[PDB]
């Protein structure tokens, strides 16, 4: 009835993982220096939490599926592994040999039949068995009603959907990080209670970001190049860091699962579906997707976050390779600080003197990480200026003066205070949807062999 | 005899609650972390109430219902549900299965004539059954004597009243949003103890309201469009946000529940009506109306609301999509606050220090959103202003100048202080009142298939 | 249960110990006094771990090993001998006569195998034996699956690695110093928990450095050469000193095992192999290695290093056998000292204070060695600069400025601070990989004497 998680007893991730799970008991147990901990545990109790939901004697289809985790549970999954990624074969050795080592020792699971299974695909790669099979999302052949997708990243979601619901599905869950700043597309950012900080390719080679490297120079003045960049634009190509653990990724299929409230597929069938945020914990989500045929309602194409902590994007100054540019920079700030600065920005004060407070309140252990705080304590300076800029500068009701054009006026700073939301338009009406194995003899046997005894 | 709530043990909204329910006892008991909890809170509160007054052997007509929340009641309910909404398919499949789960364990509410009268229905698509219909309010064929609409705003409500009437309802209860802000006819709104926003759909990129989006720009001064604006004016279109889920409205709809305190009804058959307030939280407002046959008395027209906490109206400035405008906010104020700033408002305060006093007075445990604060300020540092201008330039008793015009003096603040009222002149004379079942054949052979086991 | 380590009850070094390795139970018991005591007990304590991992019945090459120290082991070891080191006759000598001491009072392990092999080899060099063989990494011809790499500096990590792959070997494990200073190209630094110190050739006759020695002059200002030298860079030849031992190394050797990711393996035959960083302790890390047949996914040719103590890399002037020079210098700093200093550096502070306010800091028992103060002062004056030019010339959003040349500016500190993360671009595509005994008659005529008894 508790439930272990593997951080130390004196975490203060605790009381906040507590606080987002009111239904269950946590219990820390640590037994390892993982240094990206808090993500682990944020996943392991998500998935807890969506077996309670769901009824048995349904069955699972786990896309994109590592079959390790799910041997010794008791409900039915079958797992969806197509190895098109360079840590799957060392996944695929490990299922083996977590199943070959207890064989008799339990009893209670279908392990017998899961060894079969895979003894059965591995002679023929071409057939589907209840527990495993070696295909893609959209080349399954297996009939079910609920599909999880636990840190996918790779598909496109409304495809992806479509062809789960045409053989079934009503109900699926996703689980990972919140995809709100690529909609406000940022160049950089950091999720900081899980550690973990993501850079777009072309800023590699700053000085000051969460991710990046570079090296000492005496500043050498000609740099003569004739190639003219003259923009620094957000491009597709991302790279994300949790812990030590190195993974990239594409922007295209970020902004993809960014869904909106009500939308409908259109198709040879037709589907209406709902998304709903149902856990969220300082940048990490679990959210509920519903479908069911035929055409009902209509659809605005609105989707909404609401915001528990305060979340910030800015401009700063930094030195690339060597060159003074500019760029935007996305962060998440803890609520009680955000209360405490709310009398200091009724006026202009300087970034050294926001610097002074913040560190004043912070270290009062540690609230918020100390490596974002001279970039808060900017963007705070930037926000109070702005505001008062607009109150010296008051309007006429009911008018919009066009005199034959109108300015716009200079933003560098744009701050969602706690429970505000953001509200962004996206597309709701889906109507365009559009093999071989992929193993290798070696390996084929090397699993036989591992298998056979 | 206890009523459990789905809250945290420690929050503040238990006290306001305590004091607008005196004759139950209310005991936390938290199961989820939903963000909009405690409006579903007052929502449960309010059908135990409305229970608690009328007596059985009447059957209730359940305007837009959703069954799966009254199979577990012990009264007798008729539910109108048309397919109108692209929520509604997944309302329904989620009560086929609560009745197929519970079939034989409950055995003290007529779950067996319910599922009977859904597969009925199922069967022929426009048959009236004593638990359940298809049709909408004007269409429905079942007699009744009371009618219960639950977070409804979708209806015009004489035009429906007049067809409840005409079967034979004489009490009719409505619960939802104080209806207020809409006719002062404001361009956005809070409601903060509900962590609910809202705002005209054409001010949907603002920048510091509670429900927008916007993004960094330097300023270009040319934005050079011929198409001549010009006016900002409110439109029928708005959307609102409780929590993380979105719910667009029609002003029109919404104002048409404002109803004044003596009305009458004119058709084939005639009838007079009454509308009261019995239930009022921080915004959240329970409404019972009575309906008799003739004509008796007469109208005046007038609608009269009672402030409980404080009200407040402002002009503010903002950039909406980077150009600077100027339109109206409207929001709640807690009574103690009030009352502690009739000291300070006898002389002119600058925003500034209104907001250091309000700082000072709030975090003394947060007794309103900081978020709202900055506007607060501004709104009161003009009220202020605005009395000392009258009373330095005096008229004379009885008379009115008009030298051969009058000017009009220009008011940018209302302020509605506790233990005041407001009222609105509405129509009270309605004369004017003016079928495919909407229903698809796969979602019915699922509802068979589901019920039929 | 407990694992004893020779250390000091009242060292500060024993907490960091606890913390790295949370599924031991750590105990101090002091007899010698060792001057690298703290390299040697995290030494140890890695061993054990890794021995914990892994299951029985598999058997361990054990590449350019001490064999006394494996002895009272039950684990299958082979060790892999060669004698290229001056410090390889006294190791033999040692593992024979601990052998001979013991030879029927312990009789758990091999003992006696043990013997029969060693005699077996030293009759015939070329021959094999389950625990002992004289060959190199690539020549010899044991089968295994899991290989050990203990403190091993001499080798080309890949072509090494292919040629473990190809005799059936799944996993790897290497132990030892940070690869991450040599990644940045420093000359000289500092390991300061391990009391360890190195240096580039060129600069051991420098003043004020870790490792060096100079003296006194009165400073003739003739000194004519001819040689123009001219340019001060990094060569490939380092000394490290562990203590008071000495250990020459090479820059390229280091590099190479600063492995990404994610790799791929093309010879003959072909793998895909990972590398993770499981262990990390002020400077001191355990890595793990998996290989597969075949080929999959993709690579990157990116690298990670998360930090989760300061980071330090600056510009430094000295004088080199009394010619005054720069050049640079790279160390570690706790993170407790980094975070008491971020009030401080919001403001630009000369070296003096800064060195005063550290002094301040550490001296309240040291948390940091006193003779690397002066530099890492100096370091952070040059940072708070360096910010503050940033600051004062901001550039527009989007956009790379050419006018056609540009200049680079002058930098002279890095500073990765805890929680961020290092990235570098390393080579992740390979393809190309290209005897006799060594030892001598009196030689064996001395093992075989203390053997045969
Ligand atoms: N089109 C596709 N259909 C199904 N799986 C896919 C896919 N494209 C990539 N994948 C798989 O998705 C996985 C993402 S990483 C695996 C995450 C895993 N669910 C976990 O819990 O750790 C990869 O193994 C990759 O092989
Ligand atoms: N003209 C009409 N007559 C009856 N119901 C209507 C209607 N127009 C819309 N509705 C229904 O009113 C519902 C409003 S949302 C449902 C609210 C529900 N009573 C609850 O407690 O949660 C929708 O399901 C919609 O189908
Ligand atoms: N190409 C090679 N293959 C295997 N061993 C090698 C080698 N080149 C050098 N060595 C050996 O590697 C050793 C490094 S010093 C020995 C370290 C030892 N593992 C310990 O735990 O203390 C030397 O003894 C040297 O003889
Ligand atoms: C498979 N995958 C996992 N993560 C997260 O990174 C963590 C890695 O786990 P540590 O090895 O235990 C996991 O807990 C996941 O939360 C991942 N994060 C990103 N951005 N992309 C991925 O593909 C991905
Ligand atoms: C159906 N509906 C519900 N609400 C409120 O929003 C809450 C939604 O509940 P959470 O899912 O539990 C409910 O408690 C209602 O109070 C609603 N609010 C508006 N403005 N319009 C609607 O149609 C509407
Ligand atoms: C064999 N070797 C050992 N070390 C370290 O130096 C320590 C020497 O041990 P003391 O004699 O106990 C060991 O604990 C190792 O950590 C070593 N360090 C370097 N740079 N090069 C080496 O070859 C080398
Ligand atoms: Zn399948
Ligand atoms: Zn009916
Ligand atoms: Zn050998």
């Known amino acids: 009835d508790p439930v272990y998680v593997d951080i130390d007893a004196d975490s203060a991730f605790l009381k906040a993982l507590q606080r987002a799970y009111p239904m269950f008991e946590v219990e820390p147990r640590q037994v390892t220096p993982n240094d990206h901990a808090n993500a682990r545990a944020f996943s392991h109790l998500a998935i807890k939490l969506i077996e309670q939901e769901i009824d048995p004697d349904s069955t699972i289809l786990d896309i994109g599926s590592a079959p390790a985790r799910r041997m010794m549970s008791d409900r039915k999954y079958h797992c969806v592994c197509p190895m098109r990624s360079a840590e799957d074969p060392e996944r695929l050795a490990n299922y083996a040999r977590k199943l070959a080592s207890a064989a008799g020792k339990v009893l209670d699971r279908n392990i017998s039949g899961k060894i079969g299974d895979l003894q059965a695909v591995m002679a023929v790669p071409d057939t589907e068995t209840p527990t495993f099979c070696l295909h893609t999302d959209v080349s399954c052949r297996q009939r079910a009603d609920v599909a999880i997708y636990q840190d996918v990243y790779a598909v496109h979601a409304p495809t992806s959907l479509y062809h789960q619901a045409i053989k079934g599905v009503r109900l699926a869950y996703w689980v990972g990080f919140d995809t709100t700043p690529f909609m406000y597309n940022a160049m950089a950012g950091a999720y900081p209670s899980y550690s973990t900080n993501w850079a777009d390719e072309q800023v590699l080679k700053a000085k000051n970001i969460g991710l990046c490297s570079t090296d000492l120079t005496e500043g050498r003045r000609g740099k003569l190049s004739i190639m003219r960049g003259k923009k620094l634009e957000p491009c597709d190509r991302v790279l994300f860091s949790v812990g030590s653990t190195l993974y990239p990724e594409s922007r295209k299929l970020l902004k993809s699962w960014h869904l909106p409230s009500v939308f409908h597929l259109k198709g ?9 945020t149902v856990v969220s914990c300082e940048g990490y989500v679990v959210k509920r997707i519903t479908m069911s045929p035929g055409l009902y309602g209509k659809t605005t194409g609105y989707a909404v976050t609401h915001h ?27 609520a009680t600080i955000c209360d405490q600065m709310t009398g200091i920005l009724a006026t202009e004060v300087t970034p050294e003197d926001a610097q002074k407070l913040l560190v004043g309140l912070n270290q009062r ?12 304590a900017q963007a705070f300076s930037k926000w109070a200026k702005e505001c008062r800029k607009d ?16 300015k716009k006026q200079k933003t560098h ?3 969602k205070r706690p429970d505000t939301q953001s509200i962004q338009k996206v597309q ?20 036989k062999w591992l298998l056979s005894k």
Chains 1, 2, 3 share one sequence.
């Open 365 to 376: 252990t540690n609230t918020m990480k100390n490596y974002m705080i001279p970039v808060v």
């Open 413 to 415: 700073t744009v701050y």
């Open 391 to 406: 109150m010296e500068d008051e309007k006429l009701l009911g008018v919009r003066e066009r005199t034959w054009a109108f």
């Open 428 to 447: 709701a009406e889906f109507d365009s949807f559009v093999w071989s194995s992929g193993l290798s003899i070696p390996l084929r046997t090397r699993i």
């Open 308 to 334: 528990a902590d305060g979340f910030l994007m800015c401009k700063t100054t930094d030195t690339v390779d060597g060159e003074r540019v500019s760029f935007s920079v996305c962060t998440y700030v803890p």
């Open 268 to 276: 040879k069938l037709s589907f209406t579906c709902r998304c709903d």
